RNA sequence: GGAGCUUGACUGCGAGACUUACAAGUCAAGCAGGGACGAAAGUCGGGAUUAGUGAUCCGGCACCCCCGAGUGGAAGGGGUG
RNA sequence: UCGGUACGGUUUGUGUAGGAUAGGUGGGAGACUGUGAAACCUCGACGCCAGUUGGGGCGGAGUCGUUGUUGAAAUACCACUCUGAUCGUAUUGGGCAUCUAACCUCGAACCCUGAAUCGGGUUUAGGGACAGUGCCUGGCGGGUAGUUUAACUGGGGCGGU
RNA sequence: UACUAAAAACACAGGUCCGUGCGAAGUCGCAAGACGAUGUAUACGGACUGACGCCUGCCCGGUGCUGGAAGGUUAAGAGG
RNA sequence: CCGUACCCGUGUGUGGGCGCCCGUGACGAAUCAGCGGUACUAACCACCCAAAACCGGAUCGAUCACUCCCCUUCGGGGGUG
RNA sequence: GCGGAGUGAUCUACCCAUGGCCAGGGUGAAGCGCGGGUAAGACCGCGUGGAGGCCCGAACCCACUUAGGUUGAAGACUGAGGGGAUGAGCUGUGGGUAGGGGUGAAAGGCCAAUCAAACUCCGUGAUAGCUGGUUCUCCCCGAAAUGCAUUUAGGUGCAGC
RNA sequence: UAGACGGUGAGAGCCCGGUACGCGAAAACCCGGCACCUGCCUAGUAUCAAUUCCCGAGUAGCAGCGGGCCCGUGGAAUCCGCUGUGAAUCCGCCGGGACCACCCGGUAAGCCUAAAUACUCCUCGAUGACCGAUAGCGGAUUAGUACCGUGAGGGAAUGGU
RNA sequence: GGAGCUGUCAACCGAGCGUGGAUCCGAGGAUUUCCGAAUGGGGAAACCCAGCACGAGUGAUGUCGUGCUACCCGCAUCUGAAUAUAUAGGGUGCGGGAGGGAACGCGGGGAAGUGAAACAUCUCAGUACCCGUAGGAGGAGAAAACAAUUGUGAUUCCGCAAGUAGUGGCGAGCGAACGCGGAACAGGCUAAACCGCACGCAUGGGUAACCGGGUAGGGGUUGUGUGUGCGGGGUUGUGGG
């Protein structure tokens, strides 16, 4: 999705598309949104987290 | 990265050989099966 | 028009004036270096003259202890062409 | 599987020098007697009964430098051979896959919702490493957006400059 | 076409062609979500034409659009 | 307002009917021996679904060596096999 | 005119929900029965029927010609003749769609009396090489409308005066 | 200590309110004053080889695309975002405008932190070479009023015996 | 405080009070309808209609007076489904926020007209505007800072440096810091290490090598790690723990 992160507060980024004859025009970044599904522990019922990925290798790690 | 199993699999093997896991393979496959551990203070407890 | 031998189709300059809105343009005696031709005098800083070209910014290709962001370098810059 | 690259090995071309036709070779002028047996039909990446290098085995004690009449040829000991076929320990781009466990399901049933065809969870079936989405990206795009589209002139335009 | 144009324009019923296999394609939003439709190729969207009668000749070069792997070119990435 | 109504609810009294309640009636449930409908299913099969290595039967071009003859412009064209 | 944010579907365009309305005549479709015709059914004649984006024509809806209006009675009207009038009709209520957007049987028409992008507040005192305006007195001096260049020729820079 | 200012029938230090200066308070708020309550330390601070561990992680770095900086990606460091890949713990990293070696400065990926700084809806005090009813607030006068617009919004005029 | 007063346009009639202290002035309290975040539900804001619980009223409902009843997040507590774990949710009870105000602050998005004699880079401008969010101020702040050899030593703010270096379709323009002078001057807590208790998985099913520390016994004993919860410890660059 274009989404936020939930845990990272992570979010967009704006900026400029800066064509080769410098017409900068407004693009954004955004996050690299996953829909995880996150059980709390082994046994859960793993909601729904829209996680981006620097958030699925390393901090936050269910699935 | 090595880590610590629970039952032998044709990927990662014994319980404290060496692992070489695929970056993903382990916490959609691995972890929900209750078999492997990314490794915190695991490689003592190992011991 | 022809015949000889050559590269001045030079490097550093330049009093002076032509003209000029400014930019640009044009001539330039003579000064030195190191050359050509000539026995020498001298002439030669392209063609009998006037067209054949474009400013600036910006990149390029070489030479130079010019600078070199702590210092030695360097990249990058700079002058000259 | 195509095929790879580091590699732990059996280790590659009837052009001249011919018991002998081994990228270069070479701590040495056998790895001492201390090798995969010149006995048979010998028929293989060469296949040319010739092969220094040779496939299934040899009068269970000898292809020898120094019986080289050739580059010193006795290099399965130094080059642990270029190592062509690769023999398997790895890596690992592509080619094709099968699988499910991520992920996607306006496919199914149930649960607090019975106050519900939205939601969410669970099992379920199907896809399924695809799409989608993120960051990078080639193309394409009047679909929209900002803009350009000169002057002269005997009005302007056309012509020409 | 309020407020100078009522028309030969627009629409039409009819005809083709193109797309769409179904959370359709198309459209509105960035998305969810909607409409399309609680429809389902005898349906829906788009383009042209325009009841009916006789018919709709020639051209695939230009450009679309449609399907095609000898390829060449080929940008971030791989790479060194 | 007059006359006459209708509707929703409320309070007090009266009639009988019903029925809870002791009092009769409608039935109707229990574990145990027998047995059934065969519903259901540790095997398999009647029927038929469907598909496997592997032997394969027609498809052919824009595919590679054949060259069996064609003009060539160093390059292609027919057709089994 | 350009941008940001809003405000507007009480007019108008279309749509949605629920209601209302259309005098009066006329034409006589499908159908049904009868006399039938016809081996049969097609067809005729009858009766009944009551159909239509049917006919004429009031209300209602529009607005075709025309005269009048034209500092009107009226910022679009009036008089007479007009087209539609069971329909792709009119109309009521309530609601929905909104500005590069809506809606449009399409005229670039309508979107609150000026729509090839509404209106309002804001950027904002936009900006114009264009036009207009610039207010009291006297004394002295006093031009130019040429050159060159110019996206320049009604501007300007430099010179000239 | 009062000749500020304003009023009174004119131009008032001495008529009035006041001023100069002095008093001024329950309660409130607030300045602040002492005692109570709570908050520590029952030496390892020193010196010691340095035997070992730690010093803020998907973060820093590096590559991709941008932002930002005087720095318009240029050759650009420093810093910030998003995407990949992705570290160490001091003999580590970071900076010193690419980068490299030596030399210096500091130890990011925890957070907190008064002052000087700007600000004016509001009350008090004051002033003006500020305006004096067409001025000055749109608003002296029932003012954001009447009226205008559907609405967002616009928006006056009007003082003197 | 002390003689009038009954606010005013706007001055008229009333009818009253006041020297027992009135009007009047300050501070504190009570009352404070209805709407408005508006919050019981609804709504054309200022109105319609309720639930429960007290408390009136009628013969009896109807009626009346008072209080709570919105939502969300956080917490405490019972709870816990499909399904067992267990969460999701689901009651309960306290605590909170919401909405506004002229500006000033921080974070994010971010034009255009204009200028560039056209215009697209660039400007305009980080401007207007939009969103988030608090404050009496905010932010930043305590070196992974500048400096270049004599170095200074948090931040912020004012004057210069400076229209300077630079940067610019090197056009229109944009434009620092180094560094000095000043206002003021404040530094601290943490995480990481380890030591200590606790739960839960691993460990022992004990012989565990450890019981405040030294030898000898000594119960054979939980010695020993982990996923966290908490208590000390620690806070630095002359490197520090």
Redesign the interface.
Known sequence: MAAVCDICGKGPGFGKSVSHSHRRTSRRWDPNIQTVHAVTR?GGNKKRLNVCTSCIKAGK??? | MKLILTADVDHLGSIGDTVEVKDGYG??FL??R?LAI?ASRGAQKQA
């Open positions: 082994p790690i269910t699935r | 916490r959609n972890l929900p209750g990314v």
